[PDB]
Amino acid sequence: TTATIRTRKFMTNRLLARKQMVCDVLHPGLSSVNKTEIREKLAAMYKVTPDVVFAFGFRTNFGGGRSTGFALIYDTLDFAKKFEPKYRLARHGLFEQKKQTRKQRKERRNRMKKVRGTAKAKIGTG
Amino acid sequence: VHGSLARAGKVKGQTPKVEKQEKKKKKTGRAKRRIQYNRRFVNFVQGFGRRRGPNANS
Amino acid sequence: MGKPRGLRTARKHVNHRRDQRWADKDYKKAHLGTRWKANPFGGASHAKGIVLEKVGVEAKQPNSAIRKCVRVQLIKNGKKITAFVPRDGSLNYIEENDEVLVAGFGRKGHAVGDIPGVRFKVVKVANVSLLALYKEKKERPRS
Amino acid sequence: GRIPSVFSKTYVTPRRPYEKARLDQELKIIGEYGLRNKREVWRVKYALAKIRKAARELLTLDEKDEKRLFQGNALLRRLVRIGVLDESRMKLDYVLGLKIEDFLERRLQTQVFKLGLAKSIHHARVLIRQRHIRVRKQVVNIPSFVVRLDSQKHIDFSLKSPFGGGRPGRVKRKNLKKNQG
Amino acid sequence: DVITLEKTGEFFRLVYDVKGRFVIHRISAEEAKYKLCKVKKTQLGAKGVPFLVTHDGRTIRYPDPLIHANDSVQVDIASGKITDYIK
RNA sequence: GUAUCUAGGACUACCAUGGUUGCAACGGGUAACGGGGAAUCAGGGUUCGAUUCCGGAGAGGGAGCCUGAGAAACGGCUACCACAUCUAAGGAAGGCAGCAGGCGCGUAAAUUACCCACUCCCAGCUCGGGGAGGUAGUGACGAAAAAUAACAAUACAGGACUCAUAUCCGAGGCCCUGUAAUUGGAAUGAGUACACUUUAAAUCCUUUAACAAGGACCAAUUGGAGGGCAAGUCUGGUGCCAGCAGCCGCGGUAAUUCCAGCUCCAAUAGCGUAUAUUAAAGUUGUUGCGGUUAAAACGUUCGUAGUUGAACUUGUGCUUCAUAC
Incomplete structure (x- = not known):
């Protein structure tokens, strides 16, 4: 039902090379909407193509067709992969x-302590 | 002083335990309590026949 | 009339107050810690005890009734209590050597009404409650 | 931990419970305002006890004492927001004169009644409860709202549930489906 | 204290709100060069012989001799020099 | 003087005879850590605090010590005493009043779950470790918000209004409130359940398709009905027996108190009950009690502590100015 995601609360934050956003998402007579589709729509608003539009927020609000979220859009993939x-x-x-x-590894680390130095020995026992 | 205890629960055993019968499940709160305010107030526009009874048989 | 109502008499009120509060019955119980010392509950709200005997307690005049009490020994103290079995028929529910909850009669000690020396109630037999059992809502765990 | 739970018992059941005249008033208040049981009445009655008490404390102070001015005016404005208070009442002196009924009315349990889609106090209530009322965009479970003035106009049918016309009955669909076989 | 977020350039001083809170306060990049230091104590003996210590724990050697406790000094920051004092 | 990081009887020689006490010392008790605080209130108070913070203390009871900026450390050591453990019998190694878990004690209190993603800490650290903490599970201490039905209409019911007739009395009939398991379609999801959202990854919420309402369904209670205390001088059974009753009292054959039923009341997702506390309690009295007889003047006085204590001792005014009437 046309959707129309128009996004409040802009921050140009160049210290994490990212426009960090609130997403206000209309779907006003249905609801919902998958994060993947939210990235696709948002991508062609800032020209940064969808696999960078890193959007983690989100609550489908009270009784209809709004979700207030957060999107983060990272200028280079290279910076995205770093922060x-x-x-x-x-x-x-x-x-x-x-x-x-995790608790499997902890048990192994405790076994590692017991016997003098070596430590490769009890990687093997583990 | 030491009268006995021989007679313990003779009445509980000799009462026939009259059938649980029913007469209608009365509704949940909002509905039921409003149901009772017909009973108490509106039904119960009360004839001035010097008081009456919720629990009057005859 | 009496009270030292002078400007710097100030100690004397406290001293005299403590002399007067000495007689205060509730404060005697609190300060002297009588609950823990003498009263069979150690100010502890409930006590689990073991049933010794069932007693056919003859009522004070003008009431001629056999009012059905139970001798209980508390687990903490071995202290002997007589407790009443409130609500109907109930000695039949008590059974000698069962584990019973002893609760009081809400009377700051003082023996019930016309019931000689029974400062206490019973609220439970075999962890179910008496109360449930009379109505029939619950059935006694085996042994 | 942190520090959490700041409680406050909203929630005083009356100093003497079995006074005939009182009983009837509570019982009538449940009829005129279809509140489940008398505890729902005691939430409001205890709410009044807080509000009346807060008013009285501030009245004994002299206006223009800042402490009276800041708090008194603010509590007054809040009650005006709820629709309890009319401008002639907007002084702490008239807040003393306040009745139970004024608060209860502002619930949507009494407002859908006024605005003909219920035609009765009774019908308005149940609808809200199961989740049929919208305050503007939002479907609202809780009947006890004590609705602030300017959201009174936004009281409507929920839009994707079947009046606002999606899903019809689902009775309609059952009945349509019977003739389909 | 001057917090400079070089990319992109905002330049801050931490100064106080009337509500006794820190503020976000944006300062000119030339105001950002210095800062004002209240002087805790002036003592004589450590190199090269008098020394002045500020409330931001900076010790500035050989202070102007008229600088007395509870004065303020402008500190050049790029070098740790006193380049003004208000009695 | 010595010790120590430091004053210091902390310690030691010598030398003095002091120090503390009815303003309750010294001693004993304490469910006595302290405070910030909590509970209950008309206020004044009374009570509480073991616990979410802050400080201190301890880590089976005690003592001693190394390291290190810092520990007289216990999830360091060394020792003893008490406990507990393994052992090829020579020995050695331990501190759940840490997190879970188990036993025991008791009135009394949860999972042998998951995670460093949040919060932050430590480390050599962007990164690791973290039962610090977060997360879920358990949880009617306690607090907070209410799903469990609603409307015409039908069956008869009430109260106005009308036609009437006007003790009586019938017919039309309304906003309604209902006693009916009669009807009729509607409303909205609690629950359920794709999906999405949540989340570190799941969970529940907040979202929402597909589903779910004639209660016998989406199906509410716990005490009471003689009085206190709100509601049966009801009906069967029992008949001072059983048993009831916080109290006064009921029950000795119309039982309005019992045991049921039916009817109903009061508070209903809560209510009963116990214990402690507080209001009431003015029954603790500083505020704010009583003392002829009700519980109360020491037999009486001297009298010290305690306690209290008369008048008189920068002060009135006069004038004018401004400033309310």
Whole structure:
């Protein structure tokens, strides 16, 4: 139903090479709308093409067809890949990183302590 | 003093425990309490017959 | 009439106040910590006790009734209490050597009404409550 | 932790409970204003006790004492926002004279009544509760609102639920589907 | 204290709101060169013999001899020099 | 003088005879850490505080010590005493009043979950570690907001209005309020459930398709009905028995108190009850009690502490100016 995302609260912040935004999203007689579609629409407003339009905010408000969000739009992909905060890249993931799930590693690290120095020895035990 | 306890729950066993019958599930709060204010106030425009009774049989 | 109503008499009121509050019955109980010392509850709201015996307590005049109390020994103190079994039939629900909750009768100690020396209530047998059991809403756990 | 929970019991049930005259007034107040049970009445009655008490404290102070001026005028404005207060009342002196009823009226449980899509106090209430009222753009579960003036005009049918005409019945769809077989 | 966010250039001094809060206060890039330092203490003995210490813990050696405790000094910042004092 | 980071009887020699006390010292008790605070109020108070902060203290009880800017450390060491552990029997190693968990104690209090993403800390650090903290799970201490139905109409009901007739009395009939399981389509999702949103990743909320209302469904309670205290001089059973009753009292055969039913009341997502506290309680009296007889003048006086204490001692005015009438 035409949507029309028009975005409040602009900040030109060149210290993280990013226009950091609030997104006010209309879909006023339906609701919702996928982040991927939000990037696509927003991309062709600032000319920065969609896989940089890093938008994490969001609450579908009260009873209809508004979501107030935040978008972050990063000038170069190179700067995007540097400030990251890593997990944000991974959601839209060309970046997929390693579940541990962490308490397995802790048990191994405790085993590593016990025996004098070596430490490669008990990588192998682990 | 030491009368006994021999007679314990003779009445609970000799009362036939009259059927639970019902007569209508009375509604939830908003509905029911408004249902009662017909009973108390409007129905109950009260004839001035020197007081009456919610709990009068005959 | 009495009170030292002078400008710098100031100590004397406190001293005399403490001399007068000595007689204050509620403050005696509080300061002397009588709950913990003498009263079978250690100011503790409830006590679990073990049922010794069922007692057929004959009422004070002008009431001739057998009013059905229970001897209870608290787990903390081994202290012997007589507690009343309130609401209907109830000794049949008590059963000797069951674990029973002893609660008081809301009377700042003082024996009930016409019921000799029964400062206490029973609220539960075998962790269910008496109250539930009479109405029939609940059924007694086995043993 | 942090420090969280600042409580305040909104929530005093009356000093003597079983006084006939009082009972009838509460009972009537539930009829005229279809509040579930008397605790909903006691929320407002206790709300009044806070408001009346706050007023009285500030009245004893002399106007132009700053402390009276800042707080008194502000509380007054807030009650004017709620629609409780008419300009002739906008002095703390008239705030003493305040009744239970004024507060209850501002609930939407009494406002959809006025504005014919309920035609009754009773019908207005239930609709809000299950989630049928919009305050402008927003579908609002909570019947107890005590609605501020300028949102009174924005009281409407929710737009994608089936009056505002999407989904019809779903009774209509059931009944349409019966004749379809 | 002058906080300079060189890219893009805002130039700040941290100064106080009447509400006893810090403010975001944008200063000229030439105002950003200096700062005003209230002097805590002037003592004699450490190199090369008198020294002045500011409330921002900066010790400025050989102070003008008329600078007495609770005075302010303009500090050049690029070099740690006193280049004004208000009695 | 010595010690120490420092004054210092902290310690030691010598030398004096002091220091503390009815303004309650010294001692004993304390569910006694302290404060910031909390509860309850007409105010005044009374009570509370173990706990979300701040400071201090301790880490089984005690003592001693190294390192290091800093620990007389315990998720450091060394020792003893008490506890607990393994062992191939020679020995060695330990501190859940840390997080979970278990046992025991008791009236009494949760998961052997996940994460450093947030919050921030530490480290050599952009990066690691973090039961610090966040997250979920449990949670009617407690607080906060209410889904559980609504409208015509039909069946008869009331109260105005009219036609009447005017004790009586019938017919039309309305904003309504209803006692009906009669009807009829409507309303809105709590729940459920794609999807999206949430989130570190899930959860619930906030969103929303597909679903869900004739209650027997989306199906509310807990105490009471003689009085206090609000509501049965009801009906069956019981008959001073059983049992009820915070109190006064009920029950000895119209039981309006019992045990049910039915009817109803009062407070309903809460209510009952216990314990402690506070109001009431003026029954603690500083505010603000009583003392002839109700509970109350010491037998009486001297009398010290305590306590209290008369008048008189920069002060009135006169004039004028400004400034209210």
